[PDB]
Amino acid sequence: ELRSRSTEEEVDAVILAVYRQVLGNDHLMSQERLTSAESLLRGREISVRDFVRAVALSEVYRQKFFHSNPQNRFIELNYKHLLGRAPYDQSEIAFHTDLYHQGGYEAEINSYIDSVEYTENFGDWVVPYFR
Structure with missing residues (x-):
């Protein structure tokens, strides 16, 4: 699924798809919905990547995958x-354990989102999907 201009139903589908990919589901509580960022995406004020980032940096993602998981599970x-995708091997897990230990939560999350690999596969306007 890609952005563009025709959207409306498309925008709606993009939004839900981001939730499904990034959080694992699109049936969250209303307190969990990042409605402000959804509005920006709909208004074309931010990109799909920006919206992915807002979800991953939210308290929803932190509580779901970060706080109550061993570090290596968080990374995976x-x-x-x-x-x-899954990590290629344990070296990727070691590398991000070091990244996290040195730069913190946001540094870790943003490493994936701003990565060449992310840009190459999804860019700014395609919803991430399992490859």
Whole structure:
């Protein structure tokens, strides 16, 4: 699914699809919906990537995958949700454990989202999907 201009139903589908990919489902509580960022995306004020980022940096993502998971599970889940793939091997897990230890939560999350690999596969306007 890609952005563009025709949207409306399309925008709606993009929004739900981002939730499904990044959080694992699109049936969240209303307190969990990032309605402000949804509005920006709909109004074309931010991109699909921006919206993916807002979801991954939200308290919803933090509580779902980060806080109550061992670090290596958090990392594996980052790979699956943000890049649409499992880590290639344990070296990727070691590398991001070091990244996290050194830069913190947001540095870790943004590493995937701003990555060349993300740009290459999804860019600014395609909803991430499992590859």
